[PDB]
């Protein structure tokens, strides 16, 4: 795997991924609801024209995050075995320099990895399900499947990924970690 940093657009969010090769397909970030950085990253107001599905029916991001934390406490083991809320803020994808929205969602566990993920709906079914429910971008970076039907999780050839294009998944993993290390923004990790 790898750890990588995403800068807040307006603070670094460290993610753990077993698919660093898919970085050019990371279209949003998800933090555990209990993640220490959430309160820091919560915007004062919603952006104009925000998708209502993203707001949990809250008037402000802070109210929505408080309500989400309170609501998920009413879940039992039954429910725990896709919902979430936009923080109103963005991080920068270090591969493409693009802003990506930051969410909390209870599908991300606080005490595992770094407690935060990069979301790649094209290639992780959990992220595909979330993106379909919320109306988030789904981008193909590994050719081999059909992202309109389901996340493609297998080996393939890199597309839409600049200096990774044409590489196999194993080659792209090595190349992107090299790039992250040269930039000081990530590391390979067991």
Ligand X SMILES: CCOc1cccc2c1[B@-]1(O[C@@H]3[C@H](O1)[C@@H](COP(=O)([O-])[O-])O[C@H]3n1cnc3c(N)ncnc31)O[C@@H]2CN
**List of residues contacting ligand X (CB under 6 A):** 16-19, 22, 108-109, 112-113, 115, 117-120, 123-124, 127
Instruction: Give the helix/strand (H/E) hosting 38.
Output: helix 38-41
Q: Min. distance of Cβ 49 from ligand X in angstroms?
A: 27
Q: Between 3 and 50, whose beta carbon lies closer to ligand X?
A: 3
Q: Name residue 59's beta-bridge partners.
A: none
Could you give the CA distance from residue 97 to residue 116 in angstroms, rounded to a whole number?
19
Q: Min. distance of Cβ 48 from ligand X in angstroms?
A: 29
Q: Between 46 and 68, whose beta carbon lies closer to ligand X?
A: 68
Q: Which residue has the tokens 């725990």?
A: 80
**End-to-end Cα spacing for the chain:** 6
Cα distances (angstroms) measured from residue 161 to each of 21, 68, 148, 177: 9, 35, 19, 14
Q: Between 46 and 113, whose beta carbon lies closer to ligand X?
A: 113
Q: Between 22 and 93, whose beta carbon lies closer to ligand X?
A: 22
Q: Min. distance of Cβ 93 from ligand X in angstroms?
A: 12
Closest residue to ligand X: CB criterion = 113
């Amino acid at each position: 795997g790898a750890v990588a940093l995403f800068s807040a657009r307006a603070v670094d969010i460290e993610v753990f991924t077993t698919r660093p090769d898919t970085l050019f397909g990371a279209t949003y970030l998800v933090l555990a609801p209990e993640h220490d950085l959430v309160d820091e990253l919560v915007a004062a107001s919603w952006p104009a024209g925000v998708n209502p599905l993203w707001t949990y029916g809250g008037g402000t991001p802070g109210e929505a995050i408080a309500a989400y934390r309170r609501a998920i406490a009413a879940k039992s083991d039954l429910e725990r075995q896709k919902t979430g809320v936009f923080l109103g803020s963005y991080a920068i994808n270090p591969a493409n320099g693009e802003p990506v929205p930051i969410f909390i969602a209870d599908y991300v566990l606080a005490g595992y990895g770094t407690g935060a993920i990069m979301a790649v709906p094209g290639h992780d079914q959990r992220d595909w399900d979330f993106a379909r429910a919320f109306g988030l971008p789904i981008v193909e970076v590994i050719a081999g499947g059909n992202i309109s039907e389901s996340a493609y999780t297998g080996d393939g050839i890199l597309v839409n990924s600049d200096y990774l294009n044409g590489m196999s998944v194993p080659a792209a993993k090595r190349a992107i970690v090299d790039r992250l290390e040269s930039a000081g923004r990530g590391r390979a990790r067991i």
